[PDB]
Amino acid sequence: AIAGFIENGWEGLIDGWYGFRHQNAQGQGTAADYKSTQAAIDQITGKLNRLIEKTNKQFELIDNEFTEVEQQIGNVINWTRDSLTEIWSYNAELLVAMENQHTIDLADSEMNKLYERVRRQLRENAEEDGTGCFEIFHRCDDQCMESIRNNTYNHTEYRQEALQNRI
Amino acid sequence: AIAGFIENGWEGLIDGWYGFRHQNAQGQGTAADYKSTQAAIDQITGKLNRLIEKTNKQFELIDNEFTEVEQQIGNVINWTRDSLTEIWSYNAELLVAMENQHTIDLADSEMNKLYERVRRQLRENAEEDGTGCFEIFHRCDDQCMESIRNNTYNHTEYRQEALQNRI
Amino acid sequence: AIAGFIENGWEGLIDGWYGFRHQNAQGQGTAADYKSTQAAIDQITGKLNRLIEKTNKQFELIDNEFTEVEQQIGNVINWTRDSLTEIWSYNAELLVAMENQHTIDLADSEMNKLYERVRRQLRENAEEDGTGCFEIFHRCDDQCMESIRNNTYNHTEYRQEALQNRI
Amino acid sequence: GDKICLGHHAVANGTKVNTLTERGVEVVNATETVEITGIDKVCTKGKKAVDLGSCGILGTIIGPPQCDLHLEFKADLIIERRNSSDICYPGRFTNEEALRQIIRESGGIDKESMGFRYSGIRTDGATSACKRSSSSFYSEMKWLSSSMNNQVFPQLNQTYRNTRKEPALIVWGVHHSSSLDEQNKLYGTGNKLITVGSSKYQQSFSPSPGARPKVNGQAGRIDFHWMLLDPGDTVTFTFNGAFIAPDRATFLRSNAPSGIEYNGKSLGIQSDAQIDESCEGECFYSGGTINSPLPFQNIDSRAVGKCPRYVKQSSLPLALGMKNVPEKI
Amino acid sequence: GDKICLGHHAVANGTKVNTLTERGVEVVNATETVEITGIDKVCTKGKKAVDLGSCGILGTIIGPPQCDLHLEFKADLIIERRNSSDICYPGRFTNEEALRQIIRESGGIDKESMGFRYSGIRTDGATSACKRSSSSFYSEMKWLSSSMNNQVFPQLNQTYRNTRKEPALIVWGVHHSSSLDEQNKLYGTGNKLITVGSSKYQQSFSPSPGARPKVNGQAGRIDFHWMLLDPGDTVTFTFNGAFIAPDRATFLRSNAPSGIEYNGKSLGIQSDAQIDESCEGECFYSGGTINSPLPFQNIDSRAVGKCPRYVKQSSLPLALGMKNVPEKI
Amino acid sequence: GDKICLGHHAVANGTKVNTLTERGVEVVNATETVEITGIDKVCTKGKKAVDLGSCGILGTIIGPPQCDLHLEFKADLIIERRNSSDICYPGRFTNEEALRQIIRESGGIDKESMGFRYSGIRTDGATSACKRSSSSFYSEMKWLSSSMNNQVFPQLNQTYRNTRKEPALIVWGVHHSSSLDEQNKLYGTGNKLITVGSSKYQQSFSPSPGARPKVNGQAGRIDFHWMLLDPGDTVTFTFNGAFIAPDRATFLRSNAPSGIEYNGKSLGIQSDAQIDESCEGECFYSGGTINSPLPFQNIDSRAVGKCPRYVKQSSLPLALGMKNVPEKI
Ligand SMILES: *[C@@H]1O[C@H](CO)[C@@H](O[C@@H]2O[C@H](CO)[C@@H](O)[C@H](O)[C@H]2NC(C)=O)[C@H](O)[C@H]1NC(C)=O
Numbered sequence A, B, C: 001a002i003a004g005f006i007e008n009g010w011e012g013l014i015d016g017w018y019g020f021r022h023q024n025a026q027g028q029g030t031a032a033d034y035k036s037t038q039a040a041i042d043q044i045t046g047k048l049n050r051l052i053e054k055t056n057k058q059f060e061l062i063d064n065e066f067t068e069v070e071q072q073i074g075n076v077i078n079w080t081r082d083s084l085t086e087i088w089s090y091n092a093e094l095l096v097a098m099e100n101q102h103t104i105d106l107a108d109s110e111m112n113k114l115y116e117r118v119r120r121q122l123r124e125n126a127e128e129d130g131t132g133c134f135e136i137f138h139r140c141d142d143q144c145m146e147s148i149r150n151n152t153y154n155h156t157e158y159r160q161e162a163l164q165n166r167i
Numbered sequence D, E, F: 001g002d003k004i005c006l007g008h009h010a011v012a013n014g015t016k017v018n019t020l021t022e023r024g025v026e027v028v029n030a031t032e033t034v035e036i037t038g039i040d041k042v043c044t045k046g047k048k049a050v051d052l053g054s055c056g057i058l059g060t061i062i063g064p065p066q067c068d069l070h071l072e073f074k075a076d077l078i079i080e081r082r083n084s085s086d087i088c089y090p091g092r093f094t095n096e097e098a099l100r101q102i103i104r105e106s107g108g109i110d111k112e113s114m115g116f117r118y119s120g121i122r123t124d125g126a127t128s129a130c131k132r133s134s135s136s137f138y139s140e141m142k143w144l145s146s147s148m149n150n151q152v153f154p155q156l157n158q159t160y161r162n163t164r165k166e167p168a169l170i171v172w173g174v175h176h177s178s179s180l181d182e183q184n185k186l187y188g189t190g191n192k193l194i195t196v197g198s199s200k201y202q203q204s205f206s207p208s209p210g211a212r213p214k215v216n217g218q219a220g221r222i223d224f225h226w227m228l229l230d231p232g233d234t235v236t237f238t239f240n241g242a243f244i245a246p247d248r249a250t251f252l253r254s255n256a257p258s259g260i261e262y263n264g265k266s267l268g269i270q271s272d273a274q275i276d277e278s279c280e281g282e283c284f285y286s287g288g289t290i291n292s293p294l295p296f297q298n299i300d301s302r303a304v305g306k307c308p309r310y311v312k313q314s315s316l317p318l319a320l321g322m323k324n325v326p327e328k329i
């Protein structure tokens, strides 16, 4: 028994982010989908985009670690600094968490888009099982499966058989 | 006549965030869906998460409300403070508004997911009416309804009846 | 041959953001959908909402472009200023980019909602082609098309003919 | 036909909140984010607090009468009051604000004699401005006057080495007499000079006689000057009149060795409100205490302690539920 | 077969914008967010403005010739110019920047006599550096010189109590002569001392004779010193030469009672640009006026007034339309 | 029944990260964002660096012995050390911090003679505190002593006009002797005064004799005072003893005309770590160098250079993969 993404993930898919698992008379197989994998991987370079805000700007010493500055201005400086620190700490944590949400959401989004695309290829020849699979209502040998994976499948070629089996 | 979420909300559902309303020979009923309600309610603790940024950091006086500090440093201090105020005010308003967007979006999201799940349970036994209801094309007594609500319904048990009534 | 939004955009729709393109025995046409266009256009007033953060607060000079202030406090001021500049620059770029994401996402959202709405009007009378069109399985003259566009179409009026042609 | 619908709650009237896109969107429920009300008390439960009353916080160091009970205070929270004075005989501290900041965090102060002894002179000068029964002075210093009446004044040295492993707070005064008659009446005639030497510090001072507006009925003034003398370092006072001498040095309980008289950094606040041993708080302002669950506050941008962040807005409503869409017909 | 398609617009060429995820995503339409061009005028329509010209803003207080028309100005917007001088006879203010800030927000200044009269001395010293016709002085003060030629100088007192319920701005000068011959030629011979007493303020000053590089052909200088005297408080000047005396005190129209000569806080700017009564603006900088709908500016980080926020970036494009996806075949 | 499923990867164990909604959500992959480790070297590859050793950065200007090799340094990076001294004969600079900041960015310093010559006096005073062989002085100045032994000291003038088109850094000293015996032993007897005049600058100083704690076995001190003299402007020193005179002026290589001895703004850092010509970095702190791809750092909030932004948090994990959902049965 095989199951799609609504149920869970696939520990065995080590070749890509998204993929197809099938069952037919010839047996059972899993293959990564290259295009959607790259698509996802390509929106992942946050690290130097998080870094592309890393400054053009050079800062100098404003106080003195060896010979303490006078008390009043030392208090103003120290206060200002810890104030900027609160703010950057807050910015950094917010940026990371926003990036994290975007990354998670967009991963689901891509998986969902692949799923929708396959559903539309299959037209009236298949039904959704509720777990992220399509029950295909006609024989689909290995080559037919391949044609679903590479977006070649011609629903009209199996329509008549599939409709009969559905009804 | 009954209508789903695409039309509107239910003033009468006081028991939960989301629910099922049905009609059959034995009458009309509404029941909260507990699981998805809690799911939504559980992502609501923003108040102390908005607060979890409330500082470890202690601030001291830098100026004097009773004996005014010298003019020039008092101008610098005052200016610095109002500058940080602009910034926090802006952060606070942005944080609240982002939380508000997420809360609204995620509520729709959950409602949509419950709906999708029911659609997939019903398979070919029902049709979406376009208001957030399924027209069920077989008799569905109270116990059959219950089985839709608790995710027990076995579509194959009514398929042949339903297909006949649809066609 | 015509194609919907999943394929691409329509350069020739100059009249609205979203629209219907049809084909029938009487010919081929495109018409903007007013309501969803306005809906989108109405959530576009970012410029003065990006501006509604533009300050009530008045700032004064803290240093001197004509008679340079004493070095130490001039360094503190300058340092503080460049610090606030880093912060606002970062806030500005983040606000813009967030608004940009929202604008893009919400445009897709509206398009998708119009699409879902039509799908639900058409019920069992039509099938999605996978490009953002419906193949309609009965004659749909100009007036019938109009009725799809203005949300009047009554699926039951064509159901029997459409079911026959589907099966 | 049998039918099942999915739906979500709604209420008759919701609360408006703002999102990113839109303003005034109605949601089932919301909660306030910005505290707008404070406690009009100083909430001191579970801390050691001292209300300095009419004693200015600099007074604790030099000891005018009004500060007598505060010369060796121990405090987690120090409450300055609006009316306070650091002085009895009129005058100012140089770098006054800096020192206030030092005392505020001190955790209280501890005093120790500097072992200055004299013999030539009178070392007990007293004024009516420092009444403590008849006439006295700054408890913690000594007004070095001319021994007779119009006697020129010895060219004296005094030296004090900081024994402890903490910094010592030393303060001295310069006496600006009301008239040049009174100056050379209370001291010597030839120009008078005071040199004060640390390892680090080195500067000098001399007295400006002349009549000033009477303050506490004194035309005279004292410039108060202060230094933090490092562990090991020594300080030399060389002076020939017009000198108000330190008697006890100050140490800050915040730098003491784990033992009694420690405390740890305190928080100095300035406040108008009555004390209340009966409520808690870690955030204070002139109106009293901010104790609040919310994350922001609009009460006072100068609140001190551990505080909600201050924001200029009075309300920032937070959605606790979904968009409100009433039931149609 | 009959068919219906759903679709959205597109254009041949769109504008690139940034999102969170990606950079250079093409949208149907965009608009700029960052103002990069200013008005090269000072836009003064709807406000009271004074162009101080060659008159330094501190000059308005003491009144060198170039400031004659500005001794009692009323202004909503004060335009300092680049070339300005506060002086005619060469010299500096102590704490000069602080005062500049005080005048800038003052709303203009109002003068009132302090009722000092003299008798022993000459009170009409005049210099070639302050040409107004022949030779004159600081309109608002009086150079107290020796009455004869080489006469020692009386040990004079002067006192002025602040009548008003606003603070008074008092300024006095110390005259550093070019030589010790000229000093005791214009005053007395023995050391000269100036003591200035407030309730609060209390410090002193004495004159340093000696030749300095000529400035406006004067080797001499004046140290200008200033105080804000609180309502009720009084100030005493005690002096024996080298004294440039205040004649009128300054008040800030910002503290006056609702009546004429009020104004309210003004905005001081420093600018190179011509004035234009013909345009508006609330944001200024050296190059002129920023009047713009956009929310950010990259023109000048020191712009003052009510201003777009300053940012380092020159452009931040905002999407006003959906993602652009051209039509395929 | 033939069937096709869509699915996504998972691993047995992922990394927790935070989102907006939730905390501790598991993802296939993550990476750290906050650098926590530094290089314990000063990474100076590809830059011109000078290790000032025991030479305090203000020493480069006046030239105590320990600074001999640094009087005309050229540097892209200046390393102050913890133990450094600016002095040999004990004393302080007024406005000391401001100057340190000036030198730190200077790009190095260049000297130019001011052509002061003398004849009346001894101009070669030397101390045991400035040992360079037997006894010497501040390389860049001259201790103007009494020519005989107890001779009163001439009322001398000295003048220097800034030739260059850059600002000149001029520094002079006031000699606070150990005793009033030594003062009038090394100079004259009557009170001594030093007047220093610029176009802009104008203030004065006089000497405070008196015994101070010995520092390098000297009870005396020198107040060091400094000015920036504008292009064209001139400065006049008028003095009658107790005067430590400038011999050469300083210029900052950062303002020089495109030619040799230019450099351009340098970066001054203060550090404990050994130099390493063998690694690079643009960010420094007391512990060394922060060379990191990450955008944040938690090492030292006072790091200087071009630096990751400093944050209080030690870890902020960034998701590089989707939510992890293990495979069910
Ligand atoms: C809307 O939320 C508010 C505040 O979060 C709710 O009022 C709280 O309800 C709990 C539940 O009984 C009370 O015990 C608390 O004392 C209330 N807290 C506050 C801060 O008011 C209110 O219940 C909510 N309304 C609805 C319909 O859910």
Ligand SMILES: *[C@@H]1O[C@H](CO)[C@@H](O[C@@H]2O[C@H](CO)[C@@H](O)[C@H](O)[C@H]2NC(C)=O)[C@H](O)[C@H]1NC(C)=O
Pocket: E028, E029, E030, E031, E320
């Ligand atoms: C893109 O939007 C811009 C900016 O809003 C449009 O230009 C403005 O539109 C109005 C409407 O007639 C003009 O009168 C304004 O003067 C324009 N303002 C600016 C900022 O230039 C522009 O027309 C839009 N382009 C498209 C294809 O929609």
Ligand SMILES: *[C@@H]1O[C@H](CO)[C@@H](O[C@@H]2O[C@H](CO)[C@@H](O)[C@H](O)[C@H]2NC(C)=O)[C@H](O)[C@H]1NC(C)=O
Pocket: F028, F029, F030, F031, F320
């Ligand atoms: C998670 O991504 C990390 C960090 O980007 C991967 O680590 C990199 O692996 C490559 C190729 O092996 C190395 O040469 C890089 O230098 C690594 N970078 C770091 C920062 O360690 C890691 O392999 C990933 N894990 C998975 C399961 O993809």
Ligand SMILES: *[C@H]1O[C@H](CO)[C@@H](O)[C@H](O)[C@H]1NC(C)=O
Pocket: A074, A075, A078, F301, F302
């Ligand atoms: C700020 O100055 C204090 C003394 O007021 C000193 O202990 C500390 O080194 C400074 N804090 C930082 C991290 O710069």
Ligand SMILES: *[C@H]1O[C@H](CO)[C@@H](O)[C@H](O)[C@H]1NC(C)=O
Pocket: B074, B075, B078, B081, D301, D302
């Ligand atoms: C800042 O100082 C002003 C005077 O310069 C004073 O009146 C005011 O109390 C201060 N404002 C704030 C909010 O700190």
Ligand SMILES: *[C@H]1O[C@H](CO)[C@@H](O)[C@H](O)[C@H]1NC(C)=O
Pocket: C074, C078, C081, E301, E302
């Ligand atoms: C800060 O100071 C320098 C000289 O200290 C001055 O020229 C410069 O214009 C100032 N920079 C800014 C951004 O105001």
